[PDB]
Structure formats: structure tokens, C-alpha cells
């Protein structure tokens, strides 16, 4: 805004893990304010992923999240009245938010019978570089690379 007044609002870590990241992911997945229906799906997907991979319960999620985080995006800037595509850096919070949102939207478009199963498949693929979120990150990276001459 014109004023630079806004700030950060406090968030409560989730009960059974004490992780703020899981809280944010649950908020992103929440619809209609029906939170209680969101962490149920999140927990089911997390336990299914934990038993399928057998590595851990929380480290698999972190690895899948890390596999998707991008570092460059494209915006618009001008010098003499003409608009451009300029590549800019991404702050870590924005990286996490973008990764979670991409994962959720990728999960929502499938043909399974439950949402938790879709989440399990998407986190698995992200951890092993097959999900559509990987395609999103790669396309963003290559569009940023294409418009490299305009980087001031």
C-alpha cells in the first residue's frame, strides 16, 4: 500500500506436531472455514506417505517441499514507457507459499476417490520429481532464463 503499515499476524503451531508449516498448509487447504475437515485429510495423507516411503513422517514432506521451491520469477518493469519481462529473486516465505499452493492445486485435479490419497500421490511425486508442480517450477525457471538480457 501507499503507507507501509501492515505487519505479521501470529499463528499457532499444530497440536500433534508443533510445526507452523503444517498449520500454514492446513490453512491453505481449508475451505469454507471448516478447519476440522482439513487437518483430518492432512493427517491421513501424511501417515499414508510415511508408511509408503518408510523414511519418516515429517522429513518426507520437507524433502518434497524443498524439491519444488523456486528461486526466480518474472515481473514487469519499465524505463522508457515500454513494458518488459524482468526476472527477480524470491524471498523464502514466498517460496514456501508458492510451493504449497502449487502442490494443493495440482492435487485438486485428479481422478482418485479421496483427497488424502491425491495429496499422498502429489507429495510422493514431488519428492521423486514427477508431479506437475515440478513442471510449473521448471517452466517458471526457463521463462526467467529466456528473458535474461533485460536484467538490470
Amino acid at each position: 500500500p501507499r503507507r507501509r503499515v501492515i505487519g505479521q499476524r501470529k499463528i499457532l503451531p499444530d497440536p500433534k506436531f508443533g510445526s507452523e508449516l503444517l498449520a500454514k498448509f492446513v490453512n491453505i487447504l481449508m475451505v469454507d472455514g471448516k478447519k476440522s475437515t482439513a487437518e483430518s485429510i492432512v493427517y491421513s495423507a501424511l501417515e499414508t506417505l510415511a508408511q509408503r516411503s518408510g523414511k519418516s513422517e515429517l522429513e518426507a514432506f520437507e524433502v518434497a517441499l524443498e524439491n519444488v521451491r523456486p528461486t526466480v520469477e518474472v515481473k514487469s518493469r519499465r524505463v522508457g514507457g515500454s513494458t518488459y519481462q524482468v526476472p527477480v529473486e524470491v524471498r523464502p516465505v514466498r517460496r514456501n507459499a508458492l510451493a504449497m499452493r502449487w502442490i494443493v492445486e495440482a492435487a485438486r485435479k485428479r481422478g482418485d476417490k479421496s483427497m488424502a490419497l491425491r495429496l499422498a500421490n502429489e507429495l510422493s511425486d514431488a519428492a521423486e520429481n514427477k508431479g506437475t508442480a515440478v513442471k510449473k517450477r521448471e517452466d517458471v525457471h526457463r521463462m526467467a532464463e529466456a528473458n535474461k538480457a533485460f536484467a538490470h
Partner: protein
């Protein structure tokens, strides 16, 4: 084949394009590269990044001659006036002289009329 180890790099800088060419000290060209052919067209062709890429890709084609030393003389006011020589430095070439060779009439002919944009 041949070994020289001493060359001179000529830079043609212009508002539309940049040309880099390495030649022997008697003006016998050994290789050249341009920003236009390096994959850049239109507006991007007139950026110092294009000149840097052109200079590096031209130096990439003079390694077989075993050139050890270079001197640079440059003409034109274009934007590739600067990044080209830094990209040549990043190639490890020895730099001995930097010279300006832009032509200047001491009067001469008559320039074209101004554009009424």
C-alpha cells in the same frame, strides 16, 4: 596448422548490433561473432549482455590458434562498449592496450535530416 599467440580484437559497436573479430597483427582475420547470430533478435540484440555473449563465443573459436595476448580497439557509441572487454577478461586473455578508433570528420559530408517522431 598455425600458431600466433599475439592478436588484436576489433570491436564494432552500434545502436543496433555489435561485432567482435580477432585478427593477426597484419589484419588477417581469424574469427568473428555477432550478437545477432548468437540467438538474440529485435530489442534484446541491443543489450550489453548480448555483446558479452558474442565476445565469449568468439573467443571460444580462437582457442585452436593458441592466442596468448590481445589488445582491443573499439569504435561506436553502442551499449556493448563495455561488457565485451570484461567478458574477454573472463576468458583469461592477456590485455595490452585499449584504444578508441571512432571516426570523426574535421568539418566533411552532410548528415541526413532529423527524424520527426
Amino acid at each position: 596448422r598455425k600458431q600466433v599467440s599475439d592478436g588484436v580484437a576489433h570491436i564494432h559497436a552500434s545502436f543496433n548490433n555489435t561485432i567482435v573479430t580477432i585478427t593477426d597483427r597484419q589484419g588477417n582475420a581469424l574469427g568473428w561473432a555477432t550478437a545477432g547470430g548468437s540467438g538474440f533478435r529485435g530489442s534484446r540484440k541491443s543489450t550489453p549482455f548480448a555483446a558479452q555473449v558474442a565476445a565469449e563465443r568468439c573467443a571460444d573459436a580462437v582457442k585452436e590458434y593458441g592466442i596468448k595476448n590481445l589488445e582491443v580497439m573499439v569504435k561506436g557509441p553502442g551499449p556493448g562498449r563495455e561488457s565485451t572487454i570484461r567478458a574477454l577478461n573472463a576468458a583469461g586473455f592477456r590485455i595490452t592496450n585499449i584504444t578508441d578508433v571512432t571516426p570523426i570528420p574535421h568539418x566533411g559530408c552532410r548528415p541526413p535530416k532529423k527524424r520527426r517522431v
